[PDB]
């Protein structure tokens, strides 16, 4: 129902998601505050009673309804069991690329990079 | 069917009427991202419908 | 890349021998060309 | 017996600075709970029930201190 | 007679003090007042039932203090 | 006498620190309006028929609180 | 004699002012508890815990504080 | 009389501890002021016809605070 | 003497002014630990191990504090 | 020797005030740069209301440090 | 002679009013540490390498402090 | 008690110092808080941390003076 | 007798200046880690600012710990 991809669309009923949003984690619960936030690029998790399933993710946006359904919106994304040196090897080319506008990309790899290591 | 969407920009999405039900952080400019993101995002479904 | 594509860096960078069947490999080559346009006459050709 | 006398009155209004504590005290209570129920919805029950059970814990400080200086009226 | 009388005027002045906080405490209910109602839209009703019930037991601790106060004079 | 004199003077000046509660008491509620009015629209409406009311039950403060000076 | 009676009524007296800091202590605790659950949902359990294991932290301060002021009032 | 000039002087002295709360009161007015223009939308308009008259009754304070103390 | 145990009564007083700053100060610990338990999720591990870390060594303040008025005694 | 004592213990007692003065610049300053760290408006718009702001807050300290070179 | 003792029992106490200082300071950086923590990533290193001696330097004004109280004692 | 009273008077003008520690404090606080958000640390803000700085240290010199011409 | 006397209250009333510094290094290191809770300057940038704003807050310290230790 509401947890989309462009080309793929995930999730549906839930107890707790929790987001890495614009300033900090944050954990959405049964009844919360109506919120808009830019989602940072990091892990994210979803909830059905104990049952634990984090997925990471680009960034996007999370919006909390008053109607009480939350739409969590990104762009590409499993945990562990998706992505060592397929991480490694990249990094490499990421931080070598910010000594070089097109090295200005690259300072936004380094971040996104050095946070999936954490994972 | 020839079809036409709204688009709307960062000052409307301050400006409109239950903007205040959404306890948005005004922690620095986040209508703007949400504009600059509508404008990808409502542009990439008309394209997939244009195409199809 | 933007922060309209922030997150099709942080989703490319992202990207990069998995899931890459197709799909995603093919997510990651776009091969669009702008032109702007002017008094008719245009400017010139660039690769998105 | 004059000073017993003396610092008796001194030591009463002494004793009520201790209310600008309880005082700001109440204040920051109802603050929060007007500002909670500006985002809402819980209005009355959850919000209200915990600010009246957090002024009836601020103004204990109120109520333990206007004794001491009583007591020193008294 | 001359010490029940001067330490009951200094008596009167430092119980003045408890002011200070009845005087900041009117005035964080009233901000919070005005910062939730910049946000709606519940203000007359919901709202300023309590908005004054806080400055009510707010300066219950200035009418308790100027009492103090009024007594020693 | 010359200590009911004397006490009447300090008096007079130890009842002066109430007015520290006024004086930051005002600033508050005028802080809070000019900032609630950096969001609108409700200017010289339902906020500011508050933050004269506000100002007014802060300023009772001083006007209590000078009377004992005076008094004294 | 007598001074010591009434350096005791003044000390009972400054030892009031304590209070101030347990007041506006609780209000505190009590605040950021109504300002956490205006973010929902854990009223019961995780919050209204650690606000009352916060409050009782914070009036062991009044307790400790109206014990040295009755101590020199009796 | 001796103590009267005395307590005179530590009276005038108290008095001063008023202007304590004047002080911080400005810069609260003054702060929230900037804040809010931050954000705008306009300085010359509606923020700045308080922000002063804000500032005016916040050094009432210290005007009513001076005057006890040069009067003892 | 007679002086020494007056102003020893007065001097235990005064020591109590101390726990103002002991009070209002664990109350901002437990406050602020609620306020980021407010966004989660780190309710066990991570932070409480903190709150009574920063509560310890603000109530160690206060028994310093209580010391002195309680050596004063 | 009383009016000569008590007059150092007023100028002394007469120096907590700039307790307030002292505190009120660093309040306005800060707001100063918090606002400046949103822009655009640092050379005119904002400066101005910051020493104007900063007048009026040290117009304390001058008071203030008056009635203690007085005593 | 027995002024000297009194005035330096009045001197101890005033001597605990420094504390309310370093009382609320502590609070303040554990406060932060923990608010800060409930947002990330700086849990272990980074931010805690400094938060205890944001502890230490805050403490050390109640040392100073407390110096001159037992100096006094 | 010219000598006495000067000993107290000398200690009372310390307190004034709460106000300047604090100040500092602040506007160095809202220096790095206002870098959190960039980019100008080299020049714009952190350059003024020194003016508020100074502004607010003006404090504590005018108020150290009143202390050691209590001593001397 | 009284020069003794008023020597150690005197000692005693410095002591509260520090209740200024004490609050004053807290309030610069909680800003240190909430602005480094954002990043990505922990070391330089961050610190060089931190540390110099505690040393500018400390100095009030120093000169008010000279106050009492020299009347002591």
């Given at each position: 129902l509401q947890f989309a991809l462009p080309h793929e669309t995930l999730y549906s009923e839930v107890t707790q998601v929790n987001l890495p949003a614009k300033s900090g984690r944050i954990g959405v619960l049964a009844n919360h505050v109506p919120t808009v936030?830019?989602?940072?690029?990091?892990?994210?998790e979803v909830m059905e009673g104990?049952?634990?399933?984090?997925?990471?993710?680009?960034?996007?946006?999370?919006?909390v309804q008053p109607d009480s359904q939350l739409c969590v919106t990104a762009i590409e994304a499993p945990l562990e069991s998706f992505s060592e040196?397929?991480?490694?090897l990249l990094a490499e080319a990421k931080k070598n690329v910010s000594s070089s506008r097109e090295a200005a990309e690259a300072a936004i790899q380094v971040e996104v990079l050095e946070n999936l290591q954490s994972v | 069917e020839p079809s036409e969407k709204p688009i709307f920009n960062a000052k409307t999405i301050e400006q409109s009427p239950s903007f205040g039900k959404?306890?948005?952080?005004?922690?620095?400019?986040?209508?703007?991202?949400?504009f600059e993101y509508t404008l990808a995002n409502q542009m990439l479904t008309a394209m997939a419908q244009g195409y199809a | 890349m933007s922060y309209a594509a922030y997150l099709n860096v942080a989703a490319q960078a992202i990207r990069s021998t998995e899931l890459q069947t197709a799909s995603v490999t093919n997510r990651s080559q776009t091969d669009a060309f702008y032109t702007?346009?002017?008094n008719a006459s245009e400017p010139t050709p660039m690769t998105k | 017996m004059q000073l017993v006398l003396a610092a008796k009155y001194i030591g009463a209004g002494i004793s009520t600075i201790g209310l600008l504590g309880a005082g700001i005290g109440i204040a920051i209570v109802f603050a929060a709970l007007i500002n909670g129920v500006s985002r809402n919805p819980s209005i009355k029950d959850t919000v209200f029930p915990m600010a009246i059970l957090g002024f009836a814990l601020s103004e204990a400080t109120g109520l333990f201190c206007l004794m001491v200086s009583f007591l020193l009226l008294f």
């Open positions: 936030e830019q989602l940072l690029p990091g892990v994210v104990s049952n634990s399933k984090k997925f990471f993710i680009s960034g996007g946006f999370a919006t040196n397929i991480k490694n | 959404f306890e948005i952080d005004t922690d620095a400019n986040v209508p703007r991202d949400l | 702007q346009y002017k | -």
